[PDB]
Amino acid sequence: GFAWWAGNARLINLSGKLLGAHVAHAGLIVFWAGAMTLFELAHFIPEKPMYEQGLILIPHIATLGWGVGPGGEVVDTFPFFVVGVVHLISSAVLGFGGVYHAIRGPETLEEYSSFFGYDWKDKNKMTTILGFHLIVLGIGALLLVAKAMFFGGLYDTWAPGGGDVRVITNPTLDPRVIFGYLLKSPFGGEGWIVSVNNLEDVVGGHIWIGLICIAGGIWHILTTPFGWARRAFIWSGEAYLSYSLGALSMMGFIATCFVWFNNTVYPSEFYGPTGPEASQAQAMTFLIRDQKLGANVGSAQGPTGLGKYLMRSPTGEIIFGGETMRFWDFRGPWLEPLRGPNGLDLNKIKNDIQPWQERRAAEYMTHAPLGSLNSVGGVATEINSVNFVSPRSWLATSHFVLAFFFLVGHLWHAGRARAAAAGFEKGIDRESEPVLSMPSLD
Amino acid sequence: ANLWERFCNWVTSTDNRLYVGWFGVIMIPTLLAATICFVIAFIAAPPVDIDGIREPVSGSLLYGNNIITGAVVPSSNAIGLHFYPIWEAASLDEWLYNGGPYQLIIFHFLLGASCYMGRQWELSYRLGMRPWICVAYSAPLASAFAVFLIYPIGQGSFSDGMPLGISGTFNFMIVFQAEHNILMHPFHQLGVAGVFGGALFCAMHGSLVTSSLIRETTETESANYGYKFGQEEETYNIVAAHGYFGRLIFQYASFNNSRSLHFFLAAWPVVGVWFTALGISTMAFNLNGFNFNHSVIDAKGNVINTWADIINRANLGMEVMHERNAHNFPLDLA
Amino acid sequence: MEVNQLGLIATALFVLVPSVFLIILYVQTESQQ
């Protein structure tokens, strides 16, 4: 009953052809991970920060501890090649299962084996498929734990001495910490789970989630939905897709903020500085420049009456002045040495700023995630010269766009699923128009 | 007959003059809170230090504003993205100075308007309608989210959220153009096509139906009395509409199917406005309009200006003057 | 504020005259049916 332009809706009750669709599409995903990685390596130049180079996948690999040493210095490119090749190769196998199940295999599965076949309305079979995938997901999250604790560690931007790969020996297990994150405000200075700022807490939360996912996977294999859930949900393939579209949308919005604010699991060494980071780096840069010339940066009153270089936040912490007052919640490994318990320590600022901090600030200030669509770096009034848009701008914007449409997709499919379940998705019955049997409003 | 079940039946009743619904249960309080605070602040709020530099901007009528210049002023840049409910201030006087009302209003409004969209889904289900009118409204709703929430998040301050005022709106669009070159951004260009195009097709369709109204009246009475609410027959001649329009252009650029025509009417402005909302939402992460400043040079290397360069001179004038007291350092990075 | 004093009468009349006209035509419409 579907037109060509909604033709994939013809697969809804063809479990075999729909399996091929999913597996072929999974091959496309693995293909791009592989091809894109190899494109980036082909174009990679090691002497240049990654974020001057348009890289989004190499930074994800480096972050797992492969190919880099202290400071994010790229030491060995072969891990990058390996990751690309194995992904590219593996997509052929998925391509192969895909076109096979989509074109040649059985259209429907449930007659072949009663294990792989399903009916969308089989609430038991559906929670079982759910459970298997939960266990898979749980396994995946523990893979990350295994790499961090047993197979080389992770890149730790915070490691003393400028950042380095480090094995995680004491993952945070305390649930007050792990789940504490889930209850922090998402607003500024709190930042919900986006504020996670050390790898102990990252590894520890992946232990929890792995175990939670395995546990729940076994739960859902072993149970059937309770009646309160039976009566609150729509049980249909479109309805399940709509549930997942909403989840994907929510996750995409979270990832946007993650890559825009977090400099722990998106080290600035690889992705460029954050907006807040770059803005703080400019105040640091001129504070350094002016102090060397003799300025007393603590006592220097700016035009407004507020400190020109340093002021207080609304709770009193000493912070960088100017417009960047708005970014005082920023924390980065190049800055924290200057912080005492009242915020920025004036005596450390006067006496203890190191050349590597002057360098890092100059670099991050001149690599702020501002740029045109055609990759001219800097504010929008800047002339052509510098070919640069930050990986964080590319990653934040792309996924905001995607997250938004997936929300639209959720509303689209969730509404349709409801109307299809009640039987009026194709329009109003002229002989039984609900409103014509309702009393008039007035 | 049980108490909860009778409540549930009143919430979801299709017999209330205005539908409530479960989305309504959240919408009504939050829109009332946002409306009531908005009305009181617009009239009587004292000045608010939008940019955190102890330079309060006066936005309400009693402090010397008219309908055109008044606004509820965004909260202090010193607050950035911190949550600032009333109970976090030492007092209402402090909360007023720092722009607390803005936060109360926008959060309640965004919530209430989100529930407005859900409420549109819900009543359509209660009435046996198809469900997607709410998808049409997600385009305006996304736009509101972009200028009140997404753009502050990316910039780190509700101080750069859009002001709740007529001239505040203009201050926001001028600064946006200088910091993002929104006019040279293709998603904004799609918004304009969505909005120009939407007004065009509104005029077209209204003029085409109106041209083909079937004679049912005399010259002494409104043609509108030729249609009776609920009548089963259609009230214009669509083939006559198609026969005029197909000849004005050519046959195949005209719609003879009213369902395709009306779905086109829906999709064109909705999709344009999604894009222009996406535009604001992505320029929030500083992925800005095309930059062709000094892209044409001559054989020697002289710059040969284009219209893009002239635009840049305007942007520069906006940049250097906006928030004239707030910047101590040479680059406005947020 | 040093505002145009005639603004008030202008606004009042701008509102009152066209509104009164519409009211006159509505009430006499209703006295027919």
Binding site: S440, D442 | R17, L18, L61, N66 | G7, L8, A12, V15
Partner: peptide
């Protein structure tokens, strides 16, 4: 006086809303 005028007009609009909704000419079928 300008403040009184602006609020007065806004107040009239809000009352007009009230009548437009709850004292509308009620739509009647065929």
């Amino acid at each position: 006086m300008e403040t009184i005028t602006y609020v007065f007009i806004f107040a009239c609009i809000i009352a007009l809303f009230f009548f437009a909704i709850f004292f509308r000419e009620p739509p009647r079928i065929t």
